[PDB]
RNA sequence: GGGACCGCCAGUGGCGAAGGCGCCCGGCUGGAACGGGUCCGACGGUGAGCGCGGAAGGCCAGGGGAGCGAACCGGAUUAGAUACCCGGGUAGUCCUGGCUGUAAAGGAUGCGGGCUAGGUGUCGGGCGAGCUUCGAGCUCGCCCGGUGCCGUAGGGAAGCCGUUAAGCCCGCCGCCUGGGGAGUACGGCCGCAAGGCUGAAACUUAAAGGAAUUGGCGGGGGAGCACUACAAGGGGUGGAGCGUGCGGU
């Protein structure tokens, strides 16, 4: 019968990682993040490696078995940051055309109710 | 090489869910198949794609060689879904009360409603007041797994719109959460 | 040289630093999506039906904004 | 401590926070030699 | 397992004398509106002297400590960095019992009565209609009370206000008398302490200060431009010599 993974995509604005697990997500089959593949530090959230990570981890998938998977995007959230990285999409794009199939995609963001004081004082990160 | 050392095994749903095959997982051992979660939506169960928002979590509890049977440890709605309903100009009312089943299964139930327009708070409480007589009786008189059913059916809620016009015009009420605290 | 031609269909707008660059919509010929609609980015003049040629199709420009 | 809002504006001067935390220290001082 | 906080619904909403107050339920308690003369009969306004509670931060005694983060410890930046940036990090942030009586505690508008064009919304209560799947539901007008916008006359240096006055009258305290010296010296009182309340003098100075117009300028915003701007392409100088001229001998 056709197997279904979940791929736990976490893009920051620093980084991005690309998780994919079994059915229950309690089984790691695959897990690439971007400073796999890219040797500068400042490169690591862009779509490009978003894009190139995901497909190695996407063709490594295949081969174990696994063709359908349902997305899972999730944003630092928290007291940290809401808007996920720019390379979320990018990575969905690289499951999409590696040939898995694309079931369901949700956000799973922590949001808080009300939460921690963030970071960087009362004035904010003067930048 | 660990994963050539994997076995797969199936899972089905609970009875009153028909039991119907749910998907596969690899595990080394079986003792590892045991409480583990699986989220799964209600059109992958019944079909309906009216109520792709509701998921249901299932806890992993018998291991019959490669047959996994599990239990209903929780329901929850789409994240989306919610988000789409509530909007400004409205006033959202969070119903959570602690309930025992007919048959004594301990439950945690959130019930959630939507008015047409800003409300004044006592009219809120009755709100209130209304559903929680009302899944109070029953939970008295349905037992577990028939409530359960109910509950993601929406006729409860439906019935609950029905009582709380008398007080205000909901726009919707509905159940958003449920999680099972402990069994008999 | 595995290279994807693909046709000018449509001309967003000029893009980039210097607006030099061209924002572009192209239909992909031949490949494994054939007919899709691309939007793209153009070096050099650019006319309705050059037949731009793509190192990957998975590259689709950022949407431009004013 | 009157303060006097008009010793707030910046111009040819100090923070006035700054010279109200200077004057204590001179207090401080002051006081504690004659103890 | 632990501590903190109760997002969306949230808004000029609402309540409170003010600081301030937001998860749900049960209980105790303050206050007001609205509708009724339903009772009493000027019992009122203001308040020197007095009293009361009153954001943060600090302090005393004992607990607590998730995150955050004064001081401090490192990494980085820089001519120099006792900072901004990053990694840590104690007090504090929380609970109990006290102190300290503080802020651009600002509406920078002390409080009560009478009058003075208007329109318009929202909040609560009442009234009259109409709709109603019959709701403490839905649409329009009015009265009351609260709260915003626009705006006539009028006011004001103007900014602007304009029935929620900063208009005209009637009541009561405080406060002000060029800038600085100064919120200092001295004295007194208070407080465990930091410090709070009160507060001059000599001397110095031609102004300080407020609104608003024009320009100039912004490492503000918007629009239109290019060869003294750049993208594409080409040519070419400063390396050697010499012509010419500038500075210097």
Redesign the interface.
């Known amino acids: 019968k056709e197997k279904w993974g979940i791929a736990h995509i976490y893009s920051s604005f620093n980084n991005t990682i690309i998780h994919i697990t079994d059915i229950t997500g309690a089984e790691t089959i695959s897990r690439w993040s971007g400073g796999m593949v890219v040797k500068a530090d400042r490169d690591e959230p862009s779509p490009y490696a978003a894009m190139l990570a995901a497909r190695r981890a996407a063709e490594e998938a295949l081969e174990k078995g696994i063709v359908g998977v349902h997305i899972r995007v999730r944003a630092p959230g928290g007291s940290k940051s809401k808007t996920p990285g720019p390379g979320a999409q990018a990575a969905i794009r690289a499951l999409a055309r590696a040939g898995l199939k694309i079931g369901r995609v949700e956000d799973v963001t922590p949001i808080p109710h009300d939460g921690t004081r963030p970071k960087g004082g009362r004035r904010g990160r003067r930048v | 090489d660990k994963?050539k050392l994997?076995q797969?095994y199936?899972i089905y749903a609970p009875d009153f869910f028909g039991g119907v095959?749910?998907?596969?997982?690899?595990?080394d051992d079986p003792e590892?198949v045991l409480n583990?979660?699986?989220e799964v939506?209600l059109k992958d169960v019944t079909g309906d794609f009216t109520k792709?928002h509701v998921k249901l979590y299932f806890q992993?509890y018998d291991v019959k060689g490669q047959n996994a049977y599990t239990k209903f440890k929780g329901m929850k709605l789409?994240?989306?879904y919610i988000r789409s309903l509530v909007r400004r100009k409205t006033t959202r009312i969070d119903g959570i009360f602690n309930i025992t089943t007919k048959d004594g299964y301990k439950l945690r139930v959130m019930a959630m409603a939507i008015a047409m327009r800003r409300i004044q708070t006592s009219q809120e409480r009755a709100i209130r007041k209304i559903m929680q007589e009302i899944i109070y009786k029953k939970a008295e008189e349905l037992n577990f797994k028939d409530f359960v059913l109910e509950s993601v059916n929406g006729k409860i809620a439906a019935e609950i719109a029905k009582e709380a016009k008398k007080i205000y015009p909901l726009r919707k009420a509905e159940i958003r959460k449920i999680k099972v605290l402990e069994e008999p | 040289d595995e290279g994807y031609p693909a046709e000018v269909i449509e001309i967003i707008g000029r893009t980039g630093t210097t607006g030099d660059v061209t924002q572009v919509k192209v239909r992909i010929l031949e490949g494994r999506d054939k007919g899709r609609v691309i939007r793209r980015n153009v070096r050099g003049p650019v006319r309705i039906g050059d037949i731009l040629i793509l190192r990957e199709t998975e590259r689709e420009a950022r949407e431009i904004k004013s | 401590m009157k303060r006097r809002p008009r010793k707030w504006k910046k111009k040819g001067r100090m923070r006035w926070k700054w010279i109200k935390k200077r004057i204590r220290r001179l207090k401080r001082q002051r006081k504690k030699e004659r103890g």
């Open positions: 994963w994997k797969w199936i095959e749910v998907g596969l997982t690899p595990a590892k583990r979660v699986v939506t792709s992993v789409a994240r989306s």
